[PDB]
């Protein structure tokens, strides 16, 4: 009924690949930096408005 | 009439539409 | 004296455009996301004398349907469309909308669905066997294999409904699902018809089309424009304040 | 009364100062643990409300503890560790606190500018009483 | 201003995604581990001005606008795929194929 | 955001090629084994219309 | 009661115990 088979003496390892993780880390860092720049420019706009 | 002068008729209302139909 | 109003309107619309750009940048990693284009729009006030005051109101066109980039995940039920393909799913209100988020999922009762909303095909939403493994063809065929059963019993159990929208006639609804505009749906029917000229790819997923260079350029331009408008505001205010003393004796 | 403007601005300044103080305290206690009597530290926020005297000033009724789950860190060597050997680190959103500080500073500056303008207007008002 | 409270959501989503990636990388040696993958969703859009008349014997672009609201982490899926088999020669180790779990 | 995912796909393809090579080399003595070779193919091309 | 009002009695002195007594 769709059950698997058992192998004795063997252990299933984690199904993690590191290339995708590294690329995702790079993308996450870049997106974080660009969002930080967005925050900074909005704060600058508000400061310039309040210094009216 | 020239600007700043006197007139006997009120100016038409100002509309400033976003986009003409 | 009323130039202050034009300047403040320009500043407010610049803030709105900045908010749009920030919204586009924030969800830069959601699958199947379409960017939100924006461009300032001019509205001239006029009548009976010297039409000089022209106001600014920000506006956002539909979107840029440039296809997002594809990343390979090897998941059997990940679909990536063609240049301008769409998957149609019924929305919360019961109406149909279009999307490109290919992250299909299967519920415990054999119900296929994109995030939140079920997928529709021939007739109503498509349903698969209770625990059958699913493979998606290049033309929308859903092949099902019952676990444990020998492989020679793979059976088609339905078909996705794929539409084709070029892009200039679709507008984003309030929940992020695109729909045809009024004239487009009038001239092409309320519900679109499936076409065979659209092919999908299994195993890859589509990201989002947001241009970092465009975002940065827009941010710089908005910053400079807002600062200039603020300077005009303060200059006009100082001028009016200095000139207000004429009425004195 | 033309003088409730000062009350409104002062209430706004006090509320912004309270919110900034709460944010600064959270930032100081970002990585603290085992406060008095051993209970884990929890972050706090403030809620702004308006005083319906219509239009009125802003007040802060009370400081409300965050309901976001604490961080559970496995470290059995700490006496605070439960049967699972977990310690409860406080939930502090550094970006959230930075944004809150920025907003508080901007609101404070806007209110002080409004006070400056209204003070100039009120000083000019009295010249007609002679 | 909406920009601050939108970029805050963006930063929060990025931070949670980084946490998920770090968790996946941490247990690179845990036996029988299925990797995580975080999927987000854009929030509902807020309309300000409805679009006007179109194709009125003119080639103007649409005029409506609608501001975004931000992004939220909607779900986190574990990829229940098949991993590799490491030989340990221990008589009391079991590796299971296909799909199945020990109760 | 443009070449990152393309290079990720390339790395994944090369990893799959390495895996099948390693599997072929592993059972160099298994009786009745058949060597396997993978075949690649590019993904969908996007189009940019000219004016 | 409300901060900033007028009271006839001083508030109790403040303290910050490092550890509970």
Q: How does DSSP assign F7-42, residue by residue?
A: HHHHHHHHHHHHHHHHHHHHTSS-TT----------
Q: How far is C242 from C182, CA to CA, in rounded Å?
A: 54
Q: How far is C32 from C25, CA to CA, in rounded Å?
A: 14
Contact criterion met (CB below 8 Å) for C203 and C75? yes
Whether residue A19 and residue F11 make contact (CB cut-off 8 A), yes or no, is yes
Burial class of F43 by CB neighbour count within 10 A (0 to 12, 13 to 18, 19+) = middle
Count Cα neighbours of G15 within 13 Å in the Cβ-side half-sphere.
7
Contact criterion met (CB below 8 Å) for C66 and C191? no
Three-state SS for D29-62 is CCCCCCCHHHCCCCCEEEEEEECCCCCCCEEEEE
Whether residue A46 and residue D106 make contact (CB cut-off 8 A), yes or no, is yes
Nearest Cα to D10, choosing from D100, D124, D104, D108?
D108
Resolution for this model in angstroms, one decimal place?
3.3
Nearest Cα to C140, choosing from C172, C102, C94, C188?
C102
CB count, 10 Å around CB of C228? 14
Q: After what residues is chain A interrupted, C–N > 2.5 A?
A: none
Q: How far is F47 from C16, CA to CA, in rounded Å?
A: 32
Q: How far is D109 from A51, CA to CA, in rounded Å?
A: 8
Question: In Å, how far is E22's CA from the nearest CA of chain D?
Answer: 15
Q: How far is D27 from D35, CA to CA, in rounded Å?
A: 15
Q: Is the Cα torsion angle C183, C188, C194, C195 positive or negative in sign?
A: negative
**Is B16 touching E (CB cutoff 8 A)?**
no
Chain D hits for A43, CB-CB cut-off 8 Å, are 102, 106
Chain C hits for A44, CB-CB cut-off 8 Å, are 223
DSSP code at position D74? E
CB count, 10 Å around CB of B13? 6
How many helices and strands, by DSSP H and E, does chain E display? 1, 6
Contact criterion met (CB below 8 Å) for C72 and C203? yes
Chain A hits for D106, CB-CB cut-off 8 Å, are 43, 46-47, 50
């Amino acid at each position: 009924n769709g059950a698997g088979l058992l192998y004795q003496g063997y252990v299933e390892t984690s199904n993690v690949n590191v290339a995708e993780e590294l690329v995702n880390m790079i993308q996450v860092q870049r997106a974080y930096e660009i969002n930080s720049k967005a925050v900074s420019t909005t704060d600058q706009m508000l400061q310039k408005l309040t210094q009216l | 009439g020239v600007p700043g002068a006197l007139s006997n008729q009120p100016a038409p209302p100002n509309e400033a539409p976003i986009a003409t139909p | 004296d009323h130039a202050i109003y034009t300047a403040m309107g320009a500043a407010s619309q610049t803030l709105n455009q900045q908010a749009v750009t920030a919204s586009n940048l924030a969800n830069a990693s959601t699958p199947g996301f379409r960017a939100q284009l924006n461009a300032l729009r001019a509205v001239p006030v006029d009548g009976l004398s010297l039409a000089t005051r022209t106001l600014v109101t920000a506006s956002t066109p539909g979107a840029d349907m440039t296809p997002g980039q594809l990343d390979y995940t090897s998941r059997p039920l990940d679909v990536a469309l063609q240049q301008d393909g769409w998957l149609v799913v019924q929305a919360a209100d019961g109406a149909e909308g279009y999307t490109r988020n290919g992250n299909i999922q299967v519920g415990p009762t054999g119900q296929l669905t994109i995030q939140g909303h079920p997928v529709i095909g021939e007739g109503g939403p498509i349903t698969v066997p209770e625990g059958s493994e699913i493979t998606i063809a290049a033309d929308g065929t859903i092949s099902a294999l019952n676990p444990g059963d020998p492989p020679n019993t793979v059976a088609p159990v339905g078909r996705l409904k794929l539409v084709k929208a070029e892009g200039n006639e679709v507008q984003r609804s309030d929940d992020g699902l695109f729909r045809l505009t009024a004239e487009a749906q009038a001239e092409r029917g309320a519900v679109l018809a499936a076409d065979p000229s659209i092919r999908i790819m299994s195993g890859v997923l589509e990201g989002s089309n947001v241009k970092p260079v465009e975002a940065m350029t827009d941010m710089i331009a908005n910053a400079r424009r807002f600062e200039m408008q603020m300077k005009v505001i303060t200059s006009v205010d100082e001028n009016e304040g200095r000139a207000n003393q004429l009425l004195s004796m | 009364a033309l003088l409730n403007i000062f009350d409104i601005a002062g209430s706004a300044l006090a509320a912004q100062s309270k919110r900034l103080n709460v944010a600064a305290s959270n930032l100081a206690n970002a990585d603290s643990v085992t406060g008095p009597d051993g209970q884990p530290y929890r972050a706090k926020q403030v809620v702004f409300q308006v005083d319906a005297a219509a239009t009125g000033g802003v007040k802060v009724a009370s400081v409300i503890e965050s309901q976001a789950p604490e961080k559970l860190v496995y470290e059995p060597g700490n006496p605070l560790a439960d049967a699972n050997g977990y310690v409860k680190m406080p939930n502090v959103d550094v970006v959230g606190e930075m944004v809150n500080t920025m907003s508080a500073s901007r609101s404070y500056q806007a209110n002080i500018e409004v006070l400056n303008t209204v003070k100039s207007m009120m000083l000019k008002t009295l010249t007609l009483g002679q | 201003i909406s920009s601050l409270w939108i970029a805050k959501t963006g930063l929060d989503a990025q931070q949670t995604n980084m946490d998920v990636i770090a968790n996946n990388l941490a247990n690179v040696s845990t036996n029988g581990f299925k990797r995580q993958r975080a999927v987000f969703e854009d929030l509902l859009y807020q309309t300000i001005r409805q679009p006007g008349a179109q194709s009125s014997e003119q080639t103007t672009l649409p005029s409506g606008l609608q501001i975004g609201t931000g992004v939220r982490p909607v779900a986190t899926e574990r990829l229940h795929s098949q991993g590799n088999l490491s030989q340990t020669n221990n008589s009391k180790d079991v590796a299971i194929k296909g799909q199945g779990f020990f109760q």
